[PDB]
Design a protein around this ligand. Structure first.
Ligand SMILES: Nc1ncnc2c1ncn2[C@@H]1O[C@H](CSCC[C@H](N)C(=O)O)[C@@H](O)[C@H]1O
Ligand SMILES: Nc1ncnc2c1ncn2[C@@H]1O[C@H](CSCC[C@H](N)C(=O)O)[C@@H](O)[C@H]1O
Lengths: 220, 220
């Protein structure tokens, strides 16, 4: 099951990930994407935010620093533990499969749910539908993801791929991930009962290609 | 003014265009894009359609063949004349600048307005807003355009470009055209008071890249 292999790669890569993210090894993040998601969230003035696939918690901390109550959830223990050791906030351990079935309590009545480069699997509709249920009326899901066109690599078609982490400092195990087209993302949002209200393509002033695709979708 | 130079290139290229389109010289059209726009239109079961920038009228004819009342409008006389000589339908001569200001009567209360590779200029919001006014409540604008990612040519940024028609049979004058990003298209729709309700990226089964971007937006 490539979805189980995906989460398993995170268990193997968690430490390398903490080091990369915190030490500032990922140029796209510090130059464009961290700010892009932060500004998209702050723009909605949420009071309660759930960070889905929060990893080691950099976004939980950035939101706490601005007075926002942020709750995190992630499926990897090393990342969850690191997020908790780095801050005062609530971080839950849960897999997406558990969340899709509402099997793990992670709070509810969220103004906003964010997923920052955290939805890399194939069957995401049930998870997204589960997240909708956790939103207050008029709440929003904010997703930042790899830009489909920038990472198409000559094959613009939905399908499994493998990331070797060749450019990253540290030692990594390959990660299987599901590539999806723009149309496929928007279909998923729609099938999950979410309406796209904003689409941005964050891009550094000196870059020729966008660094990510950032979408905001509302409950209804 | 690159927008005037654009329309002027059409006056020079009109005959080459008629020949290319009718003789079946454009592979993307016969293999993917003609069907894509036709099916998107037929799917909404319109009774009255305005084809904006109708050219020589192939779409007017395809819709008439299915019992739909299609009215065309175009800014070039050679194309308008050819469209009229090829069918029983109504074709109006009008520039987009005239239409943006409601200066030329082209009918109203349209169920659907379609623009097939017809919006190649920079300032399109006023035209799109004018088109909205011509829609019945719940009517739709259907736009098929070059796929922003496929034609970015390493420079994903809004700006003027020039098409030489290198791959096309016939003799052509260069056409200035405005490249816009995906985010910029959706912003334009939004500013025009139109809501995106569907996005597709027509692509031949054996193609690695999409051939077009097809969007449907509703009045409201
Ligand atoms: N099936 C699954 N269930 C739970 N979490 C998962 C998961 N698959 C991937 N993840 C989590 O998704 C994250 C992807 S890395 C992104 C982390 C964070 N949002 C950030 O911006 O830094 C990892 O923390 C990983 O553990
Ligand atoms: N400023 C302008 N005002 C009116 N028509 C314009 C225009 N700029 C371009 N056009 C028209 O836009 C068309 C682009 S070619 C596409 C034609 C047609 N929709 C088809 O699918 O075949 C031409 O017919 C051209 O005359």
């Amino acid at each position: 099951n490539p979805e189980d292999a995906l989460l398993d790669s995170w268990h193997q890569n968690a430490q390398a990930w903490i080091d990369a993210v915190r030490h500032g090894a990922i140029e796209s993040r510090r130059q464009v994407t961290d700010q892009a998601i932060l500004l998209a969230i702050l723009g909605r003035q949420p009071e309660r935010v759930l960070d889905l696939g929060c990893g080691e918690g950099w976004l939980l901390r950035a939101l706490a620093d601005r007075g926002i109550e942020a709750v995190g959830v992630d499926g990897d223990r090393t990342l969850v533990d690191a997020a908790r050791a780095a801050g005062a906030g609530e971080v839950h351990l849960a897999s997406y499969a558990q969340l899709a079935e509402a099997k793990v309590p992670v709070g509810k009545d969220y103004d906003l749910i964010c997923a920052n480069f955290a939805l890399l699997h194939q069957d995401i509709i049930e998870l997204l539908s589960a997240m909708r249920t956790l939103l207050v009326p008029g709440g929003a899901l904010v997703i930042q993801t790899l830009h489909p066109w920038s990472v198409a690599d000559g094959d613009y078609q939905d399908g499994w791929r493998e990331e070797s982490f060749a450019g990253f400092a540290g030692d990594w195990q390959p990660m299987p991930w599901y590539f999806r087209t723009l149309a496929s993302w928007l279909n998923a949002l729609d099938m999950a009962g979410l309406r796209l209200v904003s689409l941005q393509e964050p891009q550094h002033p000196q870059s020729a290609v966008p660094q990510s695709l950032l979408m905001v979708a509302e409950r209804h």
